[PDB]
Design a protein around this ligand. Structure first.
Ligand SMILES: CC#CC[Se]c1ccc(S(N)(=O)=O)cc1
Ligand SMILES: CC#CC[Se]c1ccc(S(N)(=O)=O)cc1
Ligand SMILES: [Zn+2]
Length: 259
């Protein structure tokens, strides 16, 4: 069974032994060299359409927490930008650090942010998420950096439910949450072809990483750091540093949406 994680003994440097694609040609995350990234005039406008998003539940899966959506219809979709067709929002989650100076998976000129939000979408031409992850254009993940400063009001409902899903396998109702409250003002982005950043590390993701970080408060991120990787009644292992470091860019170019 799966026993990968983020510790010294089962962390990112070990993953390749059970998931050899860990050493593949389009792995994520990557460092975004802002000087080398080139503006691409072929990019169409990005369209984030979350008006009808229907959140359902929040789950601690022992690696992060997922806010899950009803993706049985096109209720919240991502389109445009580098994408051909329609990608349906299925969940969002975060990666974060033990300290404010680390936590993000993507880096920007080697800068690490305190955390990174991933809004995960699947290409509806493949019918279901499981089929989509087997395709090179199966997923689109919208990545948003978090820095510590002023509180993000739209994050607080998430923060306040975390006490109820402290340990692996716990879930709670999480209806009527509006993920639009997690976005920055600008939709300027970088994009490149990559992978899932956790096992199974499938090379099925078009990454769209927003240039503008959101600000969250220290109190908000401190509450992320009180979660547990372990299950109930097991010795406490704080859920911190659940990020994979940057991987080799290989034969890829990062494109910018903005001149
Ligand atoms: C804590 C612990 C441990 C040792 Se057991 C183990 C099993 C699978 C992996 S992998 N290749 O999936 O990361 C790593 C380690
Ligand atoms: C098949 C499968 C699977 C695991 Se579900 C998963 C894992 C990682 C991401 S990430 N961190 O790349 O957005 C998104 C979704
Ligand atoms: Zn992620």
């Amino acid at each position: 069974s799966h026993h990968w994680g983020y510790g010294k003994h089962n962390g990112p440097e070990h993953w390749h032994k059970d998931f050899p694609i860990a050493k593949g040609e389009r792995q994520s995350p990557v460092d975004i060299d802002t000087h080398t990234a080139k503006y691409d005039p072929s990019l169409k406008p990005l369209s984030v359409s979350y008006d009808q998003a229907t959140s359902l539940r929040i789950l601690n899966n022992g690696h992060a927490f997922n806010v899950e959506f009803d993706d049985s219809q096109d209720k919240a979709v991502l389109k445009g930008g580098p994408l051909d067709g329609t990608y349906r929002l299925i969940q969002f989650h975060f990666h974060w650090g033990s300290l404010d100076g680390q936590g993000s998976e993507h880096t920007v000129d080697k800068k690490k942010y305190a955390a990174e939000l991933h809004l995960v979408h699947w290409n509806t031409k493949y019918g279901d998420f499981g089929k989509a992850v087997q395709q090179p254009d199966g997923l689109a993940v919208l990545g948003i950096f978090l820095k510590v400063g002023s509180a993000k009001p739209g994050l607080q409902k998430v923060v306040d439910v975390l006490d109820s899903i402290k340990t692996k396998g716990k879930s709670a109702d999480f209806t009527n949450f509006d993920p639009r409250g997690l976005l920055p003002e600008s939709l300027d982005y970088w994009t490149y072809p990559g992978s899932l950043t956790t096992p199974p590390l499938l090379e099925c993701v078009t990454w769209i990483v927003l240039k503008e970080p959101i600000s969250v408060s220290s109190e908000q991120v401190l509450k992320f750091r009180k979660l547990n990787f372990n299950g109930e009644g097991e010795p406490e292992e704080l859920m911190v540093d659940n990020w994979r470091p940057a991987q080799p860019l290989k034969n890829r170019q990062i494109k910018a949406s903005f001149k």
